[PDB]
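tl;dr need the bound structure. longer version: we got a ligand (6RR) that a collaborator sent over and nobodys looked at where it sits. i said id run it. heres the input, straight from their email, havent touched it
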Amino acid sequence: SMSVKKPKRDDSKDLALCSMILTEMETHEDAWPFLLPVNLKLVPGYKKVIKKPMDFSTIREKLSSGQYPNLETFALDVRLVFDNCETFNEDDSDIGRAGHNMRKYFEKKWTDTFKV
Ligand SMILES: Cc1ncccc1N[C@@H]1CCCS(=O)(=O)C1
């Protein structure tokens, strides 16, 4: 609280590390459904159903332009990609399974990088 400071983790490397993680995501062979925004005029229903679209290129743009206040907000957007995917795609569809794979891939890198 006021004048009662918690020790807080060193965050100086967070931008670099998130960029590294995002690069690994981008180059994953199953990244293809998520590299660019869902084409709202190619994919019937997407605009109405998915309230907050997100994709890797948008995350990359926000990361490169200082639009994430902290690593938690970065993780929010990454997870949003896979949450959207799970909302819209069947689990065993190519895109659906890609989403599950990419989520697992992200969460391990996340834990390995930041959680001691
Ligand atoms: C992640 C996702 N969620 C719902 C529908 C489709 C997709 N991926 C598509 C893959 C390439 C072209 S696209 O059709 O615009 C987007």
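gonna send this back to them w/ a short note. The CA atoms of residues 103 and 116 lie 20 Å apart.
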